[PDB]
Design a binder for this molecule. Sequence first.
Ligand SMILES: *[C@@H]1O[C@H](CO)[C@@H](O[C@@H]2O[C@H](CO)[C@@H](O)[C@H](O)[C@H]2NC(C)=O)[C@H](O)[C@H]1NC(C)=O
Ligand SMILES: *[C@@H]1O[C@H](CO)[C@@H](O[C@@H]2O[C@H](CO)[C@@H](O)[C@H](O)[C@H]2NC(C)=O)[C@H](O)[C@H]1NC(C)=O
Ligand SMILES: *[C@@H]1O[C@H](CO)[C@@H](O[C@@H]2O[C@H](CO)[C@@H](O)[C@H](O)[C@H]2NC(C)=O)[C@H](O)[C@H]1NC(C)=O
Ligand SMILES: *[C@@H]1O[C@H](CO)[C@@H](O)[C@H](O)[C@H]1NC(C)=O
Ligand SMILES: *[C@@H]1O[C@H](CO)[C@@H](O)[C@H](O)[C@H]1NC(C)=O
Ligand SMILES: *[C@@H]1O[C@H](CO)[C@@H](O)[C@H](O)[C@H]1NC(C)=O
Ligand SMILES: *[C@@H]1O[C@H](CO)[C@@H](O)[C@H](O)[C@H]1NC(C)=O
Ligand SMILES: *[C@@H]1O[C@H](CO)[C@@H](O)[C@H](O)[C@H]1NC(C)=O
Ligand SMILES: *[C@@H]1O[C@H](CO)[C@@H](O)[C@H](O)[C@H]1NC(C)=O
Lengths: 66, 414, 94, 49, 49
Amino acid sequence: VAVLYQGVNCTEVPNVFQTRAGCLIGAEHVNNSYECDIPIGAGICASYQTQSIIAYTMSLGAENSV
Amino acid sequence: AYSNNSIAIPTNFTISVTTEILPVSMTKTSVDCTMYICGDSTECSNLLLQYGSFCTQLNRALTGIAVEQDKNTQEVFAQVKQIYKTPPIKDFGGFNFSQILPDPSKPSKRSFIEDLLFNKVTLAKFNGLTVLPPLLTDEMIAQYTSALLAGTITSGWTFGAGAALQIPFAMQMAYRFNGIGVTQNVLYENQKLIANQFNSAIGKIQDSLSSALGKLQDVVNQNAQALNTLVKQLSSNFGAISSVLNDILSRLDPPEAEVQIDRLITGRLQSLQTYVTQQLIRAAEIRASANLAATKMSECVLGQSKRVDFCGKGYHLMSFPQSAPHGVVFLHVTYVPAQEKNFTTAPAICHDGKAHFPREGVFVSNGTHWFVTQRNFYEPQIITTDNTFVSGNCDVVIGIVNNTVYDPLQPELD
Amino acid sequence: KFNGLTVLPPLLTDEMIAQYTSALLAGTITSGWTFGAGAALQIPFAMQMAYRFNGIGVTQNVLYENQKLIANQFNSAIGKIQDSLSSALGKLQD
Amino acid sequence: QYGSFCTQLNRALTGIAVEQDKNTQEVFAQVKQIYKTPPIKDFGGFNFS
Amino acid sequence: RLQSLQTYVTQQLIRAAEIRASANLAATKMSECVLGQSKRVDFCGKGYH
Ligand SMILES: *[C@@H]1O[C@H](CO)[C@@H](O[C@@H]2O[C@H](CO)[C@@H](O)[C@H](O)[C@H]2NC(C)=O)[C@H](O)[C@H]1NC(C)=O
Ligand SMILES: *[C@@H]1O[C@H](CO)[C@@H](O[C@@H]2O[C@H](CO)[C@@H](O)[C@H](O)[C@H]2NC(C)=O)[C@H](O)[C@H]1NC(C)=O
Ligand SMILES: *[C@@H]1O[C@H](CO)[C@@H](O[C@@H]2O[C@H](CO)[C@@H](O)[C@H](O)[C@H]2NC(C)=O)[C@H](O)[C@H]1NC(C)=O
Ligand SMILES: *[C@@H]1O[C@H](CO)[C@@H](O)[C@H](O)[C@H]1NC(C)=O
Ligand SMILES: *[C@@H]1O[C@H](CO)[C@@H](O)[C@H](O)[C@H]1NC(C)=O
Ligand SMILES: *[C@@H]1O[C@H](CO)[C@@H](O)[C@H](O)[C@H]1NC(C)=O
Ligand SMILES: *[C@@H]1O[C@H](CO)[C@@H](O)[C@H](O)[C@H]1NC(C)=O
Ligand SMILES: *[C@@H]1O[C@H](CO)[C@@H](O)[C@H](O)[C@H]1NC(C)=O
Ligand SMILES: *[C@@H]1O[C@H](CO)[C@@H](O)[C@H](O)[C@H]1NC(C)=O
């Protein structure tokens, strides 16, 4: 599982990744961007794609130039 | 002036651009039953523990509203999967979309008019009353709107049914005119004028906005008013000696304190339930408005619309979407007839015992001749066998006149 | 009215609504739809009906060669409505 | 000392009150020119008496 | 008497929302059937309009 402490500064603690949604604990941060699997918030989603949990930034879609 | 042999055709046409505003969602909140009702005391929590499962029921309702908000935003905007980009070359036959395209200089990729709309709703945590972030950041919505604009200008409607097909802009406008019953050559022979009209109209919108957004303001005002009432309601006695549970932790022992703690509990439950109910009704209303906004998005913008007064007053030509805080804005580009002239008419012309009718136009006469013209634009043409069609004998039609049809075959036979 | 329970008048008196409806009727009969997009353009009534037929895929000469019959049909139908009403309004009653 | 429930109620009721006027305005006020029919009644045999 | 007043107000709010929906639909009929000819089936009576 992963845990989310909403509204709390990550530095204050009762793998840590500070999202605007709140200090996220237990998951890893990557640099890719895929479809959104489950919504965390504030433009950040997460998934069990790779096995551990990852939290990534959702990407709207593939790109083309007519 | 209605007379049984008179009609009034326009001569000139005027473009126009009109704005429209819609709300799409509200600001999501979540509340703590225990923190609001009891503060922090153990005794109050112990006494509430037996009232029921009202707290849990409330939380379920509030989270339901929360998730519908994300669905509303998703539905209104996420209708395209390819994030198109405009080409650096800007040649659209004289049209000028500088204003409502993305300007790559500002940090937030917002167009000029989007930026103006943003700076008009200035909006006017310590009790268990939390607000939560939306799912999509504003840059994402900006990207979606930019993609829609690129799609319409470079591909017409054809991106909304399948793969994005390119086509110049002049012929897209020509097709859109043909779709309201005005032939193509009308557009072609006047392109410079339509271009100037459109530029001036968009400039006037840009000016008028920087003066208007009541519909998007009332939502914020209602939200803030409700929260202020729900918070201010914590300073009434509801029939106790005081309105602070710390004023009751002291100066009393449990046996006779519990009755006043009871009265405070009752008051604060009743306040919470009123807040939740009114919120549910408001959310349903916004849900209705968001469904309507998605429908406009999918009918006016994705393709041309034809149902009257659905995408602005006047015959509809196209639309452009723009964003705004917690809402969407439409710019409907539409068409209007300007300068009228009176002409005399007649249903059919009997050349030689045969009733000739117009294929798609209507017969007009400036007093000296007969021409046949299209319905919405005065453009005379001469009667031929390639322009009418026959039926019966000219004896049953209530209105008939006498004229000869040119029939361009006889002279050529030599 | 004697307990703090007040009713209030609407904004528009019924004559005003009557005027609005009369205006709409005048617009449709004397100008077709063209008053709903811009200036009111006049056009006889026979050709307005002809255009409305053409808009559902029935050519114009169909209307023209039978105008007296459409007129009688319409009169009889409106008379039957006038009779049937004077007999029905549950939706407005509830 | 019960609270501001009265004021809250009054605000709700007045909200309904103003929406009523907006509904009537929207359904009917769609024309700005108050046209008049001509005294001549010749519509090809139709009869709008 | 507080409890009675609140029940009355709530039911009134729900009814008003329903009438609001009906009035939007009526305005749409007014603006599509009357102002111009309509073409979407079964929106302005049974049969071609
Ligand atoms: C249709 O209306 C437009 C709007 O006035 C006319 O355009 C003007 O034409 C005059 C004379 O050609 C110019 O001096 C003006 O500068 C034009 N307007 C603008 C904004 O530039 C147009 O001429 C009209 N159509 C016809 C056939 O006369
Ligand atoms: C109605 O339009 C016709 C066509 O333009 C006018 O007839 C022309 O008039 C000019 C000026 O006298 C002549 O030079 C042309 O040779 C005429 N052409 C034809 C085919 O007749 C006519 O004068 C117009 N009538 C009115 C009352 O304006
Ligand atoms: C169109 O021309 C025809 C051919 O002359 C007209 O038909 C005759 O009109 C006169 C008018 O007095 C009648 O007396 C004749 O009985 C008609 N029939 C024939 C076979 O000559 C017709 O009336 C003209 N239409 C008009 C003037 O509106
Ligand atoms: C969290 O605390 C650090 C200092 O410990 C501070 O620099 C940072 O701005 C804080 N962030 C938030 C969101 O409070
Ligand atoms: C992700 O990007 C940041 C900065 O671009 C970099 O420091 C980091 O090493 C990158 N991580 C991976 C896994 O690529
Ligand atoms: C378009 O409008 C902008 C804004 O006034 C102007 O700077 C520009 O020169 C116009 N023309 C083109 C081709 O961009
Ligand atoms: C046509 O002429 C009549 C003359 O009485 C006038 O009343 C009417 O306004 C005119 N209409 C147009 C469109 O020129
Ligand atoms: C049109 O009305 C006039 C009355 O001014 C009448 O003389 C004429 O016969 C009418 N024509 C038709 C076709 O009804
Ligand atoms: C129209 O109907 C009315 C009502 O029966 C009748 O009095 C009148 O004669 C009819 N015809 C005309 C032209 O008004």
